[PDB]
Amino acid sequence: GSHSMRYFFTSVSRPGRGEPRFIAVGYVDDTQFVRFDSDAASQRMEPRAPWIEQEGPEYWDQETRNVKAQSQTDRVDLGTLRGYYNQSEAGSHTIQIMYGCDVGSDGRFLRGYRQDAYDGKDYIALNEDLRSWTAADMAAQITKRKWEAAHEAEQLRAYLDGTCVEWLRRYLENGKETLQRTDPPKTHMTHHPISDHEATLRCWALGFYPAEITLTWQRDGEDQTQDTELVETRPAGDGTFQKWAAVVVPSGEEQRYTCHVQHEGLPKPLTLRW
């Protein structure tokens, strides 16, 4: 199937309390594999999945060098952006960055992306053509003119549709047993009366991977969105995910309600009924 590699960077300023907190994490699909924590003793990019551990000293040196460089870029940007928004030296502020690439089941490039945020709000984003930028406000338009002038898009594109893909393809193979799997949802239904008039039906999806999934309820074929209670997909902690959707139904009419489950690991969508 298709796959992605994504890196996430968070820098949080700590006025009076030293350098900004910097945390980087890397994912292949929904599996994390590396981290860097500016507050940790090692000051090294660290492995976070068994299959990345086999990378040699040159790899960890390279990632450590480069992840530090990223932190220093972002640290300086915190000052710049504070100035752009005319904010005080006293308050804490956050820069978040996400970038990555997707490949098809043939290992070929599908698309690339990068988005930057300030204080949890869009700042600047690379467009789908990987040649142009979208600035969210007047401050970001300054950054945009700067990056257009410096041909930043071309450099990032060379990474997104080049080296990003090559590494992703390598990771996909070294981590094959973990990454090229699809664990279908183990599904079941629960049922509990709430009164003489109504009962709760909860449709469960457990132990699935990747996290992408869809649970929908229907009534005599009609979409029940939403007298439906639907929780966020959540990590089980063992590399799989969980999710449930529930409806409150008229006492004795459970037979009309169907839960529909869609997931990459299922040859056909499932239908559950009480």
């Binding site: 890196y7 480069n66 460089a69 990223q70 970038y99 990056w147 930043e152 080296t163």
Partner: peptide
């Protein structure tokens, strides 16, 4: 592997 050429805003 991460992007090797971060550029300031």
């Amino acid at each position: 592997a991460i992007f090797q050429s971060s550029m300031t805003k």
